[PDB]
Amino acid sequence: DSKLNDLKSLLKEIANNIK
Amino acid sequence: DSKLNDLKSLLKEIANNIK
C-alpha cells in the first residue's frame, strides 16, 4: 500500500511538472 | 481502495487537463 501511494505521488508530481 | 480510486481519478483529470 505504501509503495502504491508513493507511485501515485510520483505520478502526480510528474503530471504537475508538465504545467 | 477508495484512496486508489481517488488517485486514479486525479491522474485522469491531470491527463485530460493537457488536452
Annotate B1-19 with DSSP letters as a single string.
-HHHHHHHHHHHHHHHHH-
| Rounded distance between C-alpha atoms, residue A17 and residue A1, angstroms | 24
DSSP H or E segment with residue A16: helix A2-18
Given a contact cutoff of 8 angstroms between Cβ atoms, the answer to whether B4 and A11 are in contact is no
Q: Show which residues on chain B lie within 8 Å of chain A, measured between beta carbons.
A: 3-4, 7, 10-11, 14-15, 17-18
CB A11 to CB B15 under 8 A? no
Given a contact cutoff of 8 angstroms between Cβ atoms, the answer to whether B11 and A7 are in contact is no
Q: Provide the resolution (angstroms).
A: 3.6
Residues 6+ apart with CB under 8 A from A15: B11, B14, B15
B1-19 burial, b at 16+ Cβ within 10 Å, e below that, comes to: eeeeeebeeeeeebeeeee
Grid coordinates belonging to B1: 481502495
Kindly give the interhelix angle for A2-18 and B2-18, rounded to the nearest 10 degrees: 20
CB A12 to CB B15 under 8 A? no
Handedness of CA A6, A10, A16, A17 (dihedral sign): positive
CB B17 to CB A12 under 8 A? no
